[PDB]
């Protein structure tokens, strides 16, 4: 019954965003709640932000 | 009754790393200026970054060239880091053309007058074949902050050429910023402090101009803020 077929592959690049699920190896889990600007994150004495 | 901070010696330890000191700061404004400057510096410093790339024989990021080892996607990722200082124009089109076996670094870029390649040793790709030759056109814009590929589509403006390869623009040269308030005991005075701002950048913005530009932006916002028209 099928005359012909065309398959099309799309490659979609999905960036991390609020609501994806992230986890550790020890059973700690969570939903990414908010993406803050670099400035807001706490920073060490040296100035590297977490 | 107050004093004011004047820019005193501004040492450069490395080409990227610089410490800028402000000596005559009244008690209490050490932290205020440290933090305000840190914030503006990290957020708003205008910088240059690669916006788009066209390589000839490549339709999409996922294909592969003969005689190269990195994937097209990896070449894009490598170009994202290219640190370039453009003086006059906002949009430059650099042309990279190399053949033969060897690591194609940024130095091979065709040197234009207005463009300075901060670290010519930066690697881009590795050829592996005597006759393998890559030609490409990198379009670099000026901009502030962070704009991804997907948002910039708003200004599509007939993106018809399938050869055009959009790259996420991290339009920001300041990498790291810390400040230290230390008592600057001057032989005739009671309570004054020194600000030491240590800043690490990709080697595009010079320290003095960075600090000045931050002070400018903060001053403009405070200008608007002081007057109150209810």
Curated annotation (Swiss-Prot), chain A:
Co-administration of salinamide and rifampicin or salinamide and myxopyronin suppresses the emergence of resistance to both antibiotics. Acetylated on several lysine residues in the presence of glucose. DNA-dependent RNA polymerase (RNAP) catalyzes the transcription of DNA into RNA using the four ribonucleoside triphosphates as substrates. Resistance to the antibiotics salinamide A, salinamide B, rifampicin, streptolydigin, CBR703, myxopyronin, and lipiarmycin can result from mutations in this protein. The RNAP catalytic core consists of 2 alpha, 1 beta, 1 beta' and 1 omega subunit. When a sigma factor is associated with the core the holoenzyme is formed, which can initiate transcription. The rRNA transcription and antitermination complex (rrnTAC) consists of RNAP, NusA, NusB, NusE (rpsJ), NusG, SubB, ribosomal protein S4, DNA and precursor rRNA; S4 is more flexible than other subunits. In pull-down experiments interacts with CedA. Belongs to the RNA polymerase beta chain family. This is DNA-directed RNA polymerase subunit beta. It comes from Escherichia coli (strain K12). The chain holds residues 1045 to 1094 of 1342 of the full protein.
Swiss-Prot record, chain B:
Its EC number is 2.7.7.6. Changing residue 159 to K: 5-fold decrease in CRP-class II promoter-dependent transcription. Residues 156-159 are annotated as: Required for interaction with Crp at class II promoters. Keywords: Acetylation, ADP-ribosylation, DNA-directed RNA polymerase, Nucleotidyltransferase, Transcription, Transferase. One of its GO terms (biological process) is cell motility. Residues 1-229 are annotated as: Alpha N-terminal domain (alpha-NTD). GO terms for molecular function: DNA binding; DNA-directed RNA polymerase activity; protein dimerization activity. It catalyses: RNA(n) + a ribonucleoside 5'-triphosphate = RNA(n+1) + diphosphate. (Microbial infection) ADP-ribosylated on both alpha subunits by the phage T4 protein ModA. ADP-ribosylated on only one of the alpha subunits by the phage T4 protein Alt. GO terms for cellular component: cytoplasm; cytosol; cytosolic DNA-directed RNA polymerase complex; membrane; transcription elongation factor complex. Changing residue 185 to C: In rpoA101; temperature-sensitive. Changing residue 39 to C: In rpoA112; temperature-sensitive, blocks RNA polymerase assembly. Homodimer. The RNAP catalytic core consists of 2 alpha, 1 beta, 1 beta' and 1 omega subunit. When a sigma factor is associated with the core the holoenzyme is formed, which can initiate transcription. Both the N- and C-terminus interact with different regions of transcriptional regulator CRP. The rRNA transcription and antitermination complex (rrnTAC) consists of RNAP, NusA, NusB, NusE (rpsJ), NusG, SubB, ribosomal protein S4, DNA and precursor rRNA; S4 is more flexible than other subunits. Belongs to the RNA polymerase alpha chain family. DNA-dependent RNA polymerase (RNAP) catalyzes the transcription of DNA into RNA using the four ribonucleoside triphosphates as substrates. This subunit plays an important role in subunit assembly since its dimerization is the first step in the sequential assembly of subunits to form the holoenzyme. The N-terminal domain is essential for RNAP assembly and basal transcription, whereas the C-terminal domain is involved in interaction with transcriptional regulators (such as CRP) and with upstream promoter elements. This is DNA-directed RNA polymerase subunit alpha. The gene is rpoA. The chain holds residues 7 to 236 of 329 of the full protein.
